[PDB]
């Protein structure tokens, strides 16, 4: 009995006999399936996760600088040299600076100068590839006959390479699902990006172009950052010392460049997605109602909540039944004021029942009233309850 307040709701009417119903399950949308001699069932798609994403590239957006040195040579004395300019963990910049008798050289002109600093990444972002065969869909089902809830009832799990599933719904039987005639919203073009603790879905070309340090593995002992010059700047070379500075954290910079990208949650080690659209042929030949061997409830009813019109004109009513007559069928219909209680509308809940024996249990049902004026009537003869209704 989900799908009551859901705005994006489809009412699929089946055919009497063969158990063929093709439904389209979305995110944020649900479907009410109504068969002829079978209980009405709500079917919603709640979760699409994609698991085992393979890392592709990691960018560094916050760096740190450590033991740093310089080396200088006089004009004509060749290029300056440090042992760590051959080290992959060091960023170096080579340039020429004005030398003379004042710095300790015999000539006046330009001498070589090199400066290196050891690079370390404090925080990094990670992009991963997604593979449609590692998707997983989580479907929730529920039937009618219940009481105010939706905050028995079944759940199934579906994989592209295991798309069939069947759920057992108490004494209602079981219903099967064979799901996928039209499915994906994209893949093979988007990486799944992870920043500090948030996640997006970015275009591959945009991701290939981020001007930050990067290493193209998953991880090795002490990774190797490419283009580390993007977060470290050299300035103000004197004659023998160049000061090295590391640029501030780039997290806010890429957040701005990620405005208008599609965001995505993550739980857990599997990436949640907000796109749905898996089509399903559900087979409900094994869906017995629950009991037609009940009798009509003899006692009186009482409205527990004001009957409310949903977004699609259907009316929801909750009543209370005072009496140990239960379990018994609830007498419910809609008169046309009145001539003598001839059925006018149609029910959404199939075969309303009181489930408990004693003594004042509650129960909810859903109506589909006709347009114009009408009367919701619950109960038989006297001590029945009636409520006027007007549709649209």
């Amino acid at each position, epitope marked *: 009995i989900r799908c009551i307040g859901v705005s994006n709701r489809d009412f699929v009417e089946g055919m009497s006999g063969g158990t063929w119903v093709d439904v389209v399950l979305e995110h944020g949308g649900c479907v009410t399936v109504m068969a002829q001699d079978k209980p009405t069932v709500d079917i919603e798609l709640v979760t699409t996760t994609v698991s085992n994403m393979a890392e592709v590239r990691s960018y560094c957006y916050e760096a740190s600088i450590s033991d740093m040195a310089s*080396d200088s040579r006089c004009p004509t004395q060749g290029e300056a040299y440090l042992d760590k300019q051959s080290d992959t963990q060091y960023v170096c910049k080579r340039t020429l600076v004005d030398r003379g008798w004042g710095n300790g050289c015999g000539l006046f002109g330009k001498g070589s100068l090199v400066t290196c600093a050891k690079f370390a990444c404090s925080k990094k972002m990670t992009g991963k590839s997604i593979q449609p065969e590692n998707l997983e869909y989580r479907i929730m089902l529920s039937v009618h006959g219940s009481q105010h809830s939706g905050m028995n009832r079944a759940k199934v799990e579906i994989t592209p390479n295991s798309p069939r599933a069947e759920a057992t719904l108490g004494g209602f039987g079981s219903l099967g699902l064979d799901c996928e005639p039209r499915t994906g919203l994209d893949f093979s073009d988007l990486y799944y990006l992870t920043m500090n603790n948030k996640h997006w879905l970015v275009h591959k070309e945009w991701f290939h172009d981020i001007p930050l340090p990067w290493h193209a593995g998953a991880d090795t002992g002490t990774p190797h950052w490419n283009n580390k010059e993007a977060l470290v700047e050299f300035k103000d070379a004197h004659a023998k010392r160049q000061t090295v500075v590391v640029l501030g954290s780039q997290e806010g910079a890429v957040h701005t460049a990620l405005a208008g990208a599609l965001e995505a949650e993550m739980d857990g080690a599997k990436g949640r997605l907000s796109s749905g659209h898996l089509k399903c042929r559900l087979k409900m030949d094994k869906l017995r109602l629950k009991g037609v061997s009940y009798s009509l409830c003899t006692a009186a009813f009482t409205f527990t909540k004001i009957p409310a019109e949903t977004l699609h004109g259907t009316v929801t009513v909750e009543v209370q039944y005072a009496g140990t007559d239960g379990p018994c069928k609830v007498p419910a219909q809609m008169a046309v004021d009145m001539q003598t209680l001839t059925p006018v509308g149609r029910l959404i809940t199939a075969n309303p029942v009181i489930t408990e024996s004693t003594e004042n249990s509650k129960m909810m049902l859903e109506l589909d009233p006709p347009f114009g004026d009408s009367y919701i009537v619950i109960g038989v003869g006297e001590k029945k309850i009636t409520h006027h209704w007007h549709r649209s």
Partner: antibody
Amino acid sequence: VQLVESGGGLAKPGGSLRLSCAASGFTFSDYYMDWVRQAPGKGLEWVSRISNGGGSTWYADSVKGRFTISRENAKNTLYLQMNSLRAEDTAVYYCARERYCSGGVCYAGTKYFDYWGQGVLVTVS
Amino acid sequence: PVLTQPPSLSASPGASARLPCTLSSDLSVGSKNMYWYQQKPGSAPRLFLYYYSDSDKQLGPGVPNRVSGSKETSSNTAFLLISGLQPEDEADYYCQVYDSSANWVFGGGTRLTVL
């Protein structure tokens, strides 16, 4: 992974010698190579260095103009053509391999002599 | 470029020995890769210790955990840590650094003797 050296012996001043250090087991066309000599009971002195393809070579100060290191990577051997030998070349020589440096920016910037040759004796008189 | 390590000094078990290598003034020792080798009477030397800093280090193949490094810039001198002495130290330990000018430099050498 083996390093043996051939070509020792005697040579008066002005004479010449051609030292060879045949290597095997690894990709000889990848590594930097080094000759380093040692007089009997005297200190250690680097002589010559050569690149992976032989396109650039370095020599010690006391040696250039006469000695000429060379490398044919096809036969996996290291040569040292000693021309115009003089007396103070009297020393025992080894060929040393310079550490793997794929790129030129090895994992920690080490580039040292890990493997050494057995050692030949050269006596000049 | 020149680096001078003393001719020799003998060290005994039960004590600790420091082996120095006084570098010149044209080099700053704090930015130099130190390569120390081990050579015995007759046999050719193999790599003994690599040291740049206490976090940037590795030792040769087949060498135990009694040897480490030290480097003090106030002296412009590198040190080969040889602690936990044993008479089996028979080896001349050379001190080697590289330069884009001198192209390789060895120290005078130090014969590890033990009384």
